[PDB]
Amino acid sequence: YLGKELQKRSEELSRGFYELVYPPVDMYEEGGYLVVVADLAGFNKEKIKARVSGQNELIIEAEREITEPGVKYLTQRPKYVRKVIRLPYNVAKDAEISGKYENGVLTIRIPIAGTSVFKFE
Amino acid sequence: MYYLGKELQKRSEELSRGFYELVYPPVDMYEEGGYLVVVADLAGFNKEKIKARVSGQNELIIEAEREITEPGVKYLTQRPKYVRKVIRLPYNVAKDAEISGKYENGVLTIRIPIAGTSVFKFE
């Protein structure tokens, strides 16, 4: 079935672009924190990862399953997404990079070194 | 400008947002059970501000709008405020179009049947 292999070729061609640019991202500083807000709709919370590369590069990663029947007309939605962000400051070592995922929107609060510790024993 | 800082920050905003305001949201459209189906990554919107029109039987149009709490200091501004995607349809949907759909975890899914009848006491 060449038409099968074909469809696939066209899929990752069409989804290709969006796995590149997506997700759109906002970043700003408030309360002494570096906040990161990204439209990442329809993902499993457990299939979303992120880390800081040497104090300076936040890497966000997400994978999902996309399986739909026949007569595929449009296949834009990304399956794999990998966003690399340059951080304006150096993250507080022993970081507490918290994150909330609701309404498809991923929010990531990042402790700028020298602000707020928490929780002892 | 006259305060180059002002226009700078402004220029790189609706233009970079604008960048995404084109290619957004990503849409999948397929066909099963006689239902033209559309799935879209439309995260972080208030559902009372999500409308899908169908232009002259042929055009599916997804439209959305939100506001963004942009305090300061800004560094990245990619997230679109006004979304409007135009999708041409593989068929001529009846003007009786009973478009339904749901919005969960950022995903909007809409369904178009083929075809449909209409009520009694209107006209």
A and B: number of Cβ contacts within 8 A: 122
> Chain A within 8 Å of B79 (Cβ-Cβ)?
yes
Amino acid at B2: Y
Q: In angstroms, rounded to a whole number, what is the distance separating the alpha carbons of residues A15 and A80?
A: 9
Write out the DSSP string of B3-68: SHHHHHHHHHHHTHHHHHHHS-S-EEEEEETTEEEEEEE--S--GGGEEEEEETTTEEEEEEE---
Which region, left, alpha or beta, applies to residue A20 given φ > 0 means left and ψ of -120 to 50 means alpha? alpha
Q: In angstroms, rounded to a whole number, what is the distance separating the alpha carbons of residues A26 and B90?
A: 36
Within 8 A of B75 by CB-CB distance, chain A residues are 27-29, 88
Q: Contact, B83 vs B24, CB < 8 A?
A: yes
Total count of domains within chain B: 1
Q: What method was applied to determine this entry?
A: X-ray
Q: Which residue of B29, B30, B43 is in closest CB contact with A39?
A: B43
Q: Write the CATH number for A71.
A: 2.60.40.790
A33: nearest CA in chain B? Answer: B73
> Which residues, including other chains, have CB under 8 Å from residue B35's CB and lie 6 or more apart?
B111, B112, B113, B114
Domain hosting B119: range is: 1-123
- Give the strands of the sheet with B50-55, arranged side by side: B50-55, B59-65, B82-88
Q: What is the resolution of this structure in A?
A: 2.4
Within 8 A of B43 by CB-CB distance, chain A residues are 39-42, 103-105
